[PDB]
Symmetry: D2
């Protein structure tokens, strides 16, 4: 399409924010898959539905008979896309733990990160495998101080820490939201330098507010259908726009590092 | 300022709104013109290009100009004018009145249309005391220089001037108010993200130009500008630094009319 | 080609600082050539021997019968590589201008920039063509304040301003040195992001000091033979290193903008 | 000092490369000091004299009766400034281990990083404390692949990993040379943006080559006495130049992260 006049072009990227989220959640899910080495489980409990928790739970359905997503926010059941996954709010979980025997997972995954699940609640399980997502990205004193990932690695015969970074680029956290935003912002800066570009728009907003303040998952999902970037230019930049975004998405590297505990 | 996903993370929306950035930029352009005019009074001022800075620049000319007329190829842009003292004419109505009338004979002509805008031929039909042409070019870009014809538009007026707007020490592709606002926001984000404890920084941007020229909805566009320029997720307070970074980037904008002497 | 151990490689760029200087001076000389449209001159006077002036004077020898380089520093005669170019210091030029008739150029080119040639000295000529190099690059208030390029365009039937920028990149001035330094620095940042790179070294120093403080052109020319960049990496980066540098050299765009009457 | 004419000022930074090196080696030595909690040792063995190793060995003399620096390069004995530090080449250490009993350290520190000490040689010791310097900085696939820091933490009752990063900035390694170079380069970017600056020169060269190819420590030490940055500007920037460098040096954060065997 054209801009203000036919002398300027407007190009909306084919890559949408949801395609960026998808690629990142998938890398996290594949990092977990690789660490699990094809092991099968009777009951998997995943803490934290947003943002990568939903796909990671879907990915566990193949080798896990029962997959339970647990979240402190009951409205996050709406972020699950597959009915095979069971959703439990934190109160219902804690209630069932005390007055029941149905909760005894062999796989526990903590994806809550900063200010999330307490090591105390994790200590109530005895799984074969414990995976804790490390929210820390590149160095930041403020984030390191509030982080307690090591304290959460208190159960499981096998323990692992899910780490996610961008090769050659700086990111403050390993969070899917942070990574998507950083991939978009870095692509923007390089796209603006392409010949004939007037300006580059990253189609961003505080998406996290839609999910946790407005409590509207449906609206949040609609907001992710937006082109990641919109560019105003004199010449065609469509090909270079997709290449810069794809290259930045490809920088994402996710892996589970085994936390050695001999006893 | 509010909590994010949990009480361990804060969300800070900047006090500075996108409209405050737009306002500061348009005002710098209007003051650059004011300074160049040296208090000279005019009977009829014609301003080509209502969007984005033309609206305020026309309002600023009302003091020393008896009649101020905004001319735009888009008739719906009459909605971007905020003062009823500014007369609005579409390009057809102007061209018609020029041929079959004598009411159009301005002593002050201002072309703010930039890229793919007013033709030097239409400018040649006037004989003002002062001609000011806004140069859309920012920092060097071959694609933009090729399409630019600012020098060809400086064909009339006893006194000629070129309105130039740049960001001191920073790169911008154009002098456009939209380009500058976007670049100020993006550069502020880059620096804000480096503050200690910041997780991620969101520039609240979108293709605002599309709302004005594709959707043809000025009202919606104006509402979209009321949004905070930046939203930050952090562990610690960044509210004061967030405003300081933005203010410093807004201050980098330098607008001036360079006299194009001729005899 | 190994570093501290055989597990790390050291790669010195094939492109030398002199190759970057050469490419930038040639772009400036070609910008002037295109503006002159093949016009022939009897006497060309070029103010400012360092850094592009030397090559620009050499490039004028084809269409100019006499080419004179003028400079406030007499030792800069050493930066001229062709004996066909005549060298005069600023004092000798001013003396001859006042008490003589041998100086009456039809082509005047001012390349001194910041704190250089006075509009008063330029006003003493009546050439067919005048070219003033604009030292300003991208926007900077401090540099704009001290700049007086417009005041120097006071003579010549045809006037032009030599402008040089880097497309899509920020540079404070249009000066050859600054452009070489900025090309090197920007290449280094992108090279550091290549996979397996540990660190990237721009082989820079205050080269200007060797020329104007130490007053040693020979040493300065030897200093330019160094590789522009040295990289420590686990994997091969030879070709990417040359591609990033070449792309940054290619961003340089020089042109003479005609100043009407 | 002036430049080409008196209209331009040349400013050489008061901060020398050696001062930036000093701040980085000292932070590493203080990170180790803090981790050791004042514990005293009979024999400390430090692998890798260059670059931070020499000062780290000097810092251990207070609480260690015997401090031995071990290096694969015999000429690196020249980088040690204090005669109290005993120097042994790699061959001499391995020979004495097999045909002797004088080598039985209670403190082992591996600072060799990439392509350095083999876990096999580390396995030959039985110290009270083992500290392995992690050479990895922020994420890079190539560097992570060649890194084997975890495999080197095979001995010691107490294990620690010395990590060094730049808060909010990207660095490929934790190496003293990499950090100094990155601090200088980042300071240049910001210094170049100061008003009136024409250009900024980082006074860098391949210093590592002087030490390992030319095998001249003396020359290397002389090369570090140079000002870190030289700036050409119209106005005074002395105070800002030192402030930008100091702020970048301050971003360096070194710490030993404990690895608990719990056995
Ligand atoms: N104690 C707790 N128990 C269960 N869920 C929690 C929790 N504390 C926070 N959460 C939930 O966990 C999520 C924290 S955000 C996690 C981001 C995720 N690691 C990613 O990279 O996408 C939110 O859905 C929040 O509501
Ligand atoms: N030939 C013409 N005559 C009158 N108005 C025109 C025109 N071509 C474009 N325009 C109008 O001029 C504007 C071009 S956008 C101008 C951007 C402006 N310089 C700024 O910095 O804000 C739009 O309002 C457009 O509709
Ligand atoms: N008044 C004057 N007359 C003649 N030469 C001068 C002068 N003032 C300065 N110079 C010389 O002009 C040069 C200024 S350096 C300018 C940089 C050059 N435009 C480039 O891009 O390479 C120096 O060689 C200096 O000795
Ligand atoms: N197997 C080995 N045994 C002992 N020293 C070694 C070694 N391999 C390399 N070295 C030495 O250890 C140093 C590796 S350089 C590591 C850089 C250091 N971590 C810093 O940040 O300053 C060099 O001096 C090298 O000669
Ligand atoms: C990673 C992360 C987290 O674990 C908790 C929180 O509140 N915010 C983030 C940032 C993000 O979601 O990207
Ligand atoms: C400057 C400018 C212009 O003159 C014409 C156009 O279509 N777009 C822009 C960019 C902008 O408005 O910022
Ligand atoms: C451009 C320029 C100049 O006009 C005068 C001076 O002294 N230094 C420079 C910088 C440079 O040589 O690049
Ligand atoms: C850290 C490091 C290392 O462990 C091995 C090597 O060859 N180079 C470096 C880089 C540096 O010294 O910064």
């Amino acid at each position: 399409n054209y801009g203000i006049t036919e002398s300027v072009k407007t190009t909306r990227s084919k890559i949408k924010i949801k395609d960026i989220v998808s690629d990142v959640v998938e890398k996290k899910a594949n990092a977990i898959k690789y660490f699990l080495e094809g092991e099968e489980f009777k009951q998997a409990i995943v803490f934290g539905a947003y943002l990568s928790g939903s796909y990671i739970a879907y990915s566990l359905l193949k080798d896990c008979e029962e997959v339970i997503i647990v979240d402190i926010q009951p409205h996050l059941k709406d972020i699950l896309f597959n009915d095979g996954i069971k959703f439990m709010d934190l109160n219902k979980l804690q209630l069932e733990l005390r007055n029941g025997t149905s909760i005894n997972p062999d796989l526990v995954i903590d994806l809550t990160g900063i200010g999330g699940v307490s090591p105390d609640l994790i200590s109530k399980f005895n799984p074969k495998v414990l995976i804790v997502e490390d929210p820390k990205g590149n160095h930041d004193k403020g984030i390191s101080k509030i982080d307690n990932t090591d304290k959460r690695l208190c159960v499981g015969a096998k323990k692992g820490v899910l780490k996610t970074y961008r090769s050659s680029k700086f990111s403050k956290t390993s969070g899917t939201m942070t990574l998507v935003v950083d991939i978009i912002m870095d692509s923007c800066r390089e796209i603006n330098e392409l010949d004939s570009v007037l300006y580059t728009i990253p189609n961003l907003k505080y998406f996290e507010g839609t999910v946790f303040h407005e409590k509207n998952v449906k609206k949040f999902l609609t907001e992710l259908n937006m082109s990641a970037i919109t560019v105003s230019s004199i010449d065609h930049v469509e090909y270079e726009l997709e290449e810069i975004l794809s290259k930045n998405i490809s920088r994402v590297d996710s892996f589970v590092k085994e936390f050695d505990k001999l006893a």
